Amino acid sequence: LMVKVLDAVRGSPAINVAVHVFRKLTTEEEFVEGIYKVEIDTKSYWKALGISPFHEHAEVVFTANDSGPRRYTIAALLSPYSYSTTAVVT
Amino acid sequence: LMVKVLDAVRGSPAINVAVHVFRKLTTEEEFVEGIYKVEIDTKSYWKALGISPFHEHAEVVFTANDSGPRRYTIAALLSPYSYSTTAVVT
Amino acid sequence: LMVKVLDAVRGSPAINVAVHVFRKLTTEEEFVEGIYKVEIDTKSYWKALGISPFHEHAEVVFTANDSGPRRYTIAALLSPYSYSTTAVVT
Amino acid sequence: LMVKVLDAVRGSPAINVAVHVFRKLTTEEEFVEGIYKVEIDTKSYWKALGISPFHEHAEVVFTANDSGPRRYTIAALLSPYSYSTTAVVT
Amino acid sequence: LMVKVLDAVRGSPAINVAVHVFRKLTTEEEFVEGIYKVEIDTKSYWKALGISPFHEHAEVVFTANDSGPRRYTIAALLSPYSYSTTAVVT
């Protein structure tokens, strides 16, 4: 096994490189999560409550209200640039 | 095995490279999640509650209300550029 | 095994490199989480409450209200640049 | 095993490098969390309450109110730059 | 095993390097948390309350109010620069 990336560079590039080499209730093992990973406004309400939740008798009301004014302005996500003009105006 | 990417570069490129080499209740193992992964406004309400939820007797009302003003303005996602003009105006 | 990244560089590049080499209730082992990972406005309300929550008798009301004015202005996320003009004006 | 990154550099690059080499209720072992990890406005309300919470009889009201004016202005996240002009004006 | 990063440098680069080499109720062992890790406005309300909280009979009201004016202006996060002009004006 032998990988080679970007051996010779002349100039001024804008580079995003990720080299991953692998050789060989909730269970996760022998992994990698989130190599260049972006989460914007990620919501998780109920996750992995437990072994025995709400088992015998339960009266549950679940109101999830996502509202209100929300502005997300991203000029560049995971987007390298060179000799470029990036601007957000208002 | 031998991979080769972008051996020689002259100039100023805008590059997004990802080289992945592999050699050989909820269970996930020996994996990779999210190489250049973007989640915008991702919602997960109920996930993996548990072994015995709401087992015997349950009275559950589930109201998921997604409303309200929401503006997402992304000029570039995973989109490299060179010698370019990127702008968001308002 | 032998990896090689960016052997020779002449100039002024804007570089984001991540080389990962691997050789060989909630359980997570032998992993890596968050190599160049961005979380903006990430919400987790109820997670891994416990072994026996709300077991016998429970009266639970769950109101999750996400509202209000919220402005997120990011000029560049994980986006290196060279010979570039980046600006956020208001 | 032998990795090599950025052997020779001439100039003034803006570099973000992370080399990770691995060789071989809530449980997490033999891992690394947060290599170049950014959390902005991360919220976790109830997590890992305990072995036996709210077991016999519980009357719980849960109101999570996220509101109010909030401005996040980040000119560059994990985004190195060289020969560049970065500005936030108001 | 032998890693090599940034063998020869001529000039004035702006560098962020992190080399990690590994060889071989809440439990976490044999790990590293937070290599170049940034938390801005991170909130954790109830975490790991205890073995037996709210066990027999509980009347709990939970109001989490996040409001008010809040301005976060960061010109550069984990973003080295060289021959650059960085400014925040108001």
E24 is in an annotated binding site: no
Can you spell out the DSSP letters for chain C? --EEE--EEES--EEEEEEEEE---EEEEEEEEEEEEEEES-EEEEE---SSSS-SEEEEEEEEEE-S-EEEEES-BS--EES-EEEE--
A44 CB-near residues (< 8 Å, 6+ apart): B44, B47, C43, C44, C45, C47
Find the closest chain A residue to C58 by CA distance.
Answer: A58
Cβ–Cβ gap A34/C35 under 8 Å = yes
> Does D86 contact A at CB distance below 8 Å?
no
* Rounded CA separation C35/C21 (Å): 13
**Coil, helix or strand at residue A57:** strand
In a mutational test of the C interface, the residue from A25, A49, A65 whose CB has the highest number of chain C CBs within 10 Å is: A49
Give yes or no for a contact between D23 and D1, defined as CB atoms under 8 angstroms apart. yes
Q: Of the candidates C5, C34, C62, which has its C-beta nearest A5's C-beta?
A: C5
Question: For residue D26, which of C61, B17, E31, E48 has the smallest C-alpha distance?
Answer: E48
Give yes or no for a contact between C47 and A43, defined as CB atoms under 8 angstroms apart. no
* Rounded CA separation D54/C55 (Å): 7
What secondary structure letter does DSSP report for D11? Answer: S
Q: Is the CA virtual torsion B43, B38, D78, E86 positive or negative?
A: negative
Residue type, B56: E
Question: Which of left, alpha, beta for B55 (phi over 0: left; psi -120 to 50: alpha)?
Answer: alpha
Q: Which two tokens stand for residue B79?
A: 């989109």
E21 CB-near residues (< 8 Å, 6+ apart): D21, E1, E3
Q: Which CATH architecture has domain C1-90?
A: Sandwich (2.60)
* Rounded CA separation B56/A42 (Å): 33
In the block, residue with structure tokens 């308002």: B90
CA B81 and chain centroid, separation? 21
Instruction: Return the H-helix or E-strand segment holding E63.
Output: strand E57-66
Q: Which experimental technique did the depositors report for determining this structure?
A: cryo-EM
* Rounded CA separation A17/B18 (Å): 6
Q: Which two tokens stand for residue E89?
A: 């004006």
Instruction: Pinpoint the alpha helices (H) of E1-90.
Output: none
> Does D82 contact A at CB distance below 8 Å?
yes
Q: Which chains touch C (3 or more CB pairs under 8 A)?
A: A, B, D, E
Domain boundaries, chain E: 1-90
Resolution in A: 3.7
